[PDB]
């Protein structure tokens, strides 16, 4: 096979991507060992769906799990009557999602379960896959001539040949695994054939963060979760929180082997200790460094020039309301709150007007990082922790460290009921989610 | 009596204004004729209540009318659980309103009925009176030494010794009367004893406008509906719409007789005509000019200097929502709407948060002027018809000519349910009113 493993791609044909996927326990070979995971399409990750704007997607999901499940089309600005976070597909039953890909859209998106209370174990077990929306921008020489790869960053822990069960501490912290994988492979080797790489990055982990750095190289950010930046942005490293995506150009500078690493990062996960009459919570501290892949540069690399521009960001109408959403924690209870409440599917929390713009101020009053996700309505991050964002682009997840306030500009698009929640999926399952109704 | 008639004043005593008023049909002498009006306290206008900040008001209203009634404390930022627009006092019954006068308050306010569907005939018949909140600012020499008078501008029409009944055309236009009175007197004479006058002005008419101008003199605006300006503003004339108040200084320039007039003004009232196969609506055009009073200046008037400053206007927090309220008409039906709906006491139209500030954009899409009033929450008019307001002061009524948009800054104060409506009271009775709930 290709030294670099990537999920199989399924492309739309004549403007239609019609596909039947099954969610099923699947025996497979994973990181040198045999395990049974929960998969879509018999693979981990699931197949990459590759579409263009205005395509019709017709995806029939067959549920072959012992529990109910559904799909969240993460990041897609489509109707919540399609991307329905309240829908339940019972074991043995099927449901067809049908939608048109929005005309003004490009980037890396993904699909995974969103049945409240069951997301963390289902995602941790292997249920996820990517969706790429191809753009006319991909035809510019500086992108067309780059070597393109998808990197699905997802960790795993195995016990008795199955995904390790959630502990009480896992529900508090979000579960992380010792197998830190790229496209379901353990430290794969990418032997570059071109000097410029275009990497689409997806954090599909329950809770693990990836503080990305390539040895000896900067990265050039060209897209965030939901679309291109206006121009490339040079960065020395790039933090991807759970649920986030990014696309970078890598400009290989000389021959050799370069490690792509997840550098140490402290997201505020907690342990317990007892030092002679305690038994109380203590910080886990920064993650241990991980090597994600080995990048081998070609001979005498001469990278392409960077594109001078990407996509102009839309000029948005002036906002008509400001919202404040405060995140808090009860760590020992593994309970998580938005404005003092836990999720209730029957309760509407915010009511907004389609085609208006809102300012959402999301404040983290907890001690853990929380990555805040909104369905259906991509947003522009204005600032976080009081620091202006250095680029304009569509995002749908924004990470907040302890005490930080994020200011978001949120155009309301499709009408209907949808949700917002922490994308530490254990925290969502444990209540950190609310309901937005757009009319 | 004093050549200049003004309503009797009732003052708070030791910080308490405790008074029993009856609403009653009362035979009286009015403009040289005998008529029975509906009055508070046996007079037209009702007694002027004069209080200071932090006073307690305890007003027991006894209903001696054949129909139910209640009181609206127009312009007072108090709780809508006291100023209750939904309360009904049945015939023969009594109700005690008790409240504390807010500490940061000054100006001319008023009281009148607000029982939906019955306001226009009750107000037209004589049920209203003024309330003055005295200020420590009244002690500055430039105000203390002026000669002060209240001018209640209210018109009336009589038929068979009683207020003339409402016609169908009256419900469409708002009713105006041929007797254009000041303090219930017909063209009284004010023989000034001082060269500077301080006049508190109240438009307590159902629908008549007063385009005020004093012959040969400017007016110096020093207060709007609900408080002082920051400094006096010189004007050549001053339009008072129904429900509005103002306070002006007049600086008498030489000996002589000067008319205070209501100059011609076209508020968009309509008539009907038939010119050989028509029977359709036709503009009434501008009102005929009216003389309101004769002002006699004293000998060798030497007016005081104007105060350099009045009261600094509060710096308000940034707003958290923008509202749009559109006024429309169905003239032939005498139906009037806000955002396409008529009033329903059971329906909440806007929900806001106490202690936040909102921007309200009120747009008149009708052809008549409509004077928009909000209970409980005084506002700052930013602009009307796209023209910046030339002063900062609290208002609670804002006039909109055909097609004009007013932009208001609305701090939400007391919690509870209250209303907003056109102060053309016939239009309110006929549906032009909505419900705001503050929580
Ligand atoms: Cu997601
Ligand atoms: Cu969280
Ligand atoms: Cu979600
Ligand atoms: Cu009023
Ligand atoms: Cu009106
Ligand atoms: Cu009112
Ligand atoms: O999700
Ligand atoms: O009123």
Tab-separated table of N, CA and C and ligand atoms in Angstrom, chain A residues 72 74 110 112 243 373 423, ligand 1:
chain	number	residue	atom	x	y	z
A	72	UNK	N	-24.014	13.482	13.051
A	72	UNK	CA	-23.891	14.929	13.070
A	72	UNK	C	-22.963	15.235	11.898
A	74	UNK	N	-20.747	17.492	11.136
A	74	UNK	CA	-20.037	18.541	11.867
A	74	UNK	C	-19.482	19.638	10.963
A	110	UNK	N	-16.483	16.837	9.013
A	110	UNK	CA	-16.489	15.438	9.424
A	110	UNK	C	-17.850	14.987	9.940
A	112	UNK	N	-19.882	12.162	12.671
A	112	UNK	CA	-19.755	11.301	13.840
A	112	UNK	C	-21.089	11.296	14.582
A	243	UNK	N	-12.442	18.396	17.691
A	243	UNK	CA	-13.489	18.862	16.795
A	243	UNK	C	-13.001	19.885	15.780
A	373	UNK	N	-18.498	24.332	20.644
A	373	UNK	CA	-18.983	24.055	19.287
A	373	UNK	C	-20.435	24.492	19.124
A	423	UNK	N	-17.059	20.336	22.968
A	423	UNK	CA	-16.690	19.203	22.112
A	423	UNK	C	-15.678	18.271	22.770
C	1	LIG	CU1	-18.413	17.247	16.037
